[PDB]
Structure formats: structure tokens, C-alpha cells
Amino acid sequence: VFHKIRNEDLIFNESLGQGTFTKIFKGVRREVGDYGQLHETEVLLKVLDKAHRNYSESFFEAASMMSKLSHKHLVLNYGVCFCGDENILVQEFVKFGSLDTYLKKNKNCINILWKLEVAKQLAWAMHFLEENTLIHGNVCAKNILLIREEDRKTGNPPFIKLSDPGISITVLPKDILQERIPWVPPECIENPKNLNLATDKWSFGTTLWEICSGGDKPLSALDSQRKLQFYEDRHQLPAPKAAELANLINNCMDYEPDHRPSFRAIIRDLNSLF
């Protein structure tokens, strides 16, 4: 159960746009920290309308279940504000934000070894979730958060976290799932009840395609109906220009869910590209 944060300890400063049925803000939380020190902590606030009850329950149950598994590559949620007509997730503010925007802002001037390190870190997060049999269900580059940039002097790589899962595709409207092709796997387009650990292997492949493509969105030129035809004709994504990960992408985006490799196997594969 999330720690309850009082509305009077939350300051909303900047509107940052929308997620899927969420409104996003930057703000500050006033809190008591270690040694009793009084802090004003930068937070990322995700607002859900309590009138969308099924969506809010799904969102917060997913955030809560993943925050029960503390891990270096999983986002920190500080708690929640049951804030009148809205329920608000109070999350850590990750300094460099979403990875797809970061890669665009850096004009894909990122070397393959950087991409390999981020891919390995996500794979280790996903292996942890797999070992815990916890489905994330919305793995994508917008949900990879860059804590720190590479530091060439120390040799330290970039460091990422995986963000909260959001509303489950088992409750979302079908038209939203189709818009989310090719992150949502073919079996879930056929029936959202096919959500499974295998779902995250597919979406991991799509996310590696994003990373290798400098934050482009696959199939962006296709409307929903052509995205369904993509899957009907069982096509595979084009190799990214950073084609070093094309084989892994295709191996994870296997139309047969039971053939998608374990994250332990994915990590070994990534290591062998060094």
C-alpha cells in the first residue's frame, strides 16, 4: 500500500503533457527525510480522474505491485495523493527524462556501445520482473528514464530506469491498443486476455528498435488499419540503421509467444555483441 502524501505538501509547477488517460506535471513535495531534515523534493506527478474508476484502479494497482519490488532499474514511486476528485502518483523526477526524447534531442549522436549498455540494463530489469512473474505490459522507449548521462572521463555508462506500467491493456479501449502497434504484440490485438510475460519480450524488441533508431517510432507512417495489415501479413520491422541489434529485435518480436527467448538468454546475447 502506497504511502499517503497530503495535498498540502504538493506544489504543482509545470504542465508536462499527457500520458494515456493521465495528466503529467513537474512539482515539489515537502517532506521529512533522513536525520529529520526538511526537504523540498522535485517530483513527477501523474494525475488520474477518479471518475475513470476502472482506469485509475488499474493504473495504481500496477504501480503498487511494481513498487513492492525495489530494484536499481525500477522507478521510485514515493506514494500517492488521494487528492479529492483525482488520484495522483508521486514519482521521482528523473533528470534527463524519457529516452526517446533524449535520443531525438541528441540527434542520435550516440554510439552503439551506449545503446548496448542501455539495452543490457533494461534486459536486467526485465529479467528481475520475469523471475518475479510480474508483467509490465507497456515496455517502450518513452517508459525508459535516463537518470544520468555517460561520463567519458570515468568510463561510467548512461544509467536508466523502467517507469511505471500505466493502465493495463486488458482495460484499455481496443482502438488504443491498435494505435500502440507494434509495441502491443499480435496475440493481444487478437485478445487482450493473452497478456502474458511473453508480451514484454515482444515489446522489448520494439523498444530496442526505438533505441537503435534514435527515437523514431516504428510504423509511424501507418494508420491503425495498415498496422493491423502489418500483423496480418506477419511482417517484421525494418532493420534500424544501427543494425547491430536487428537479429535480437527480430528474435524477440516472434509471432509465436512461446518462442520468445528468456531475458537471461537476451542478456547473454547482448553480452556477446561486445
Ligand SMILES: Cc1cccc(Nc2nc(N)nc(CSc3nccn3C)n2)c1
Ligand atoms: C528533462 C525532463 C523533462 C520532463 C520530464 C523529466 N523527468 C521525468 N521523470 C519521470 N519520472 N518520468 C518522466 C516521463 S512522464 C511523461 N509522460 C508523458 C509526458 N511526460 C513528461 N520524465 C525530465
